[PDB]
Structure 1
Amino acid sequence: STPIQQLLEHFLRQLQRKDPHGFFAFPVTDAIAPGYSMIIKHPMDFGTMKDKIVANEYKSVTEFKADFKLMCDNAMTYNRPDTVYYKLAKKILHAGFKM
């Protein structure tokens, strides 16, 4: 466990606490969200981010934040504003930017 890995695992744990039901914690399927794989060119989720930490693909907190922002932007693009997914993506994007 390197310092960067420890730091990012801490950040990821705090972010996921804002998503207790795992809206953003798994690879979305077209069966769940028809059209998703065509609309969202660069999908991202917390499970994939955890794997990228372990593979040590993040060389910076800025890279980690880029993936988090991507995850949130994707959810706010596919889902209409009056949905639980858009609303939670917006709230955790803002709260993640704090830390």
Structure 2
Amino acid sequence: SMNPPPPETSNPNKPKRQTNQLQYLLRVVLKTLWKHQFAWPFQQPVDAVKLNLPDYYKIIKTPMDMGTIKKRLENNYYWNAQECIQDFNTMFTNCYIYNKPGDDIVLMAEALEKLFLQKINELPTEE
């Protein structure tokens, strides 16, 4: 099969707000992970056609990646911070589901998740 379209990132029928937690998720959390030496495989959707991974989208039906999360934040897609945290968690579990343990991609995902969890523990106070 061809790749699926990427996840939706801007929905004009969704309400929009700025919150301290959402701003922190973009400016501190996403920004910090994005610049990590292991971020690159997670900066865009998996191109399963070009990577010749024909079963990727047979196994992974809720794909997610940081490029998508960044666009969601930039376009006010999320109302609650948990929606964003959930997308990060989906990205990491997809990696753990599809890949064999001990693969480099898994070790990279683990390092990113550790950094993510550290940053998530310092979320600012809710309004």
| Residue 72 of structure 1: how far off its partner (Å) | 0.5
Distance in 1 between residues matched to 2:35 and 2:68, nearest whole Å:
16
Query: Under a length normalisation based on structure 1, what TM-score does the superposition of the two structures give?
Result: 0.85
- Aligned partner of 2:30 among 12, 16, 22: 12
| Residue 93 of structure 1: how far off its partner (Å) | 1.4
Query: Under a length normalisation based on structure 2, what TM-score does the superposition of the two structures give?
Result: 0.68
Task: Indicate the structure (1 or 2) with the bigger Cα radius of gyration.
Answer: 2
| Residue 92 of structure 1: how far off its partner (Å) | 1.4
For the residue of structure 2 that corresponds to 1:57, the secondary structure is coil
For the residue of structure 2 that corresponds to 1:81, the secondary structure is coil
Richer in helix (by share): 1
Match of residue 67 from structure 1: 87
| Residue 81 of structure 1: how far off its partner (Å) | 1.0
Unaligned runs of 5+ in 1: none
| Deviation by residue 1:36-95 (Cα, 9 ceiling, x = unmatched) | 111101000111011111221111222111100100110111111121111111221122
Question: Relative contact order (alpha carbons < 8 A, sep ≥ 6): 1 or 2 greater?
Answer: 2
How many aligned positions are there?
99
Paired residue type of 1:9: L
Paired residue type of 2:32: Q
- Asked if the contact 1:29–1:37 (Cα under 8 Å) also holds between the matched residues in 2, the reply is no
Identity of aligned residues (%): 30
* RMSD of aligned Cα (Å): 1.9
Q: Which runs of 4+ in 1 moved over 4 A?
A: none
| Residue 21 of structure 1: how far off its partner (Å) | 5.2
Unaligned runs of 5+ in 2: 1-17, 120-127
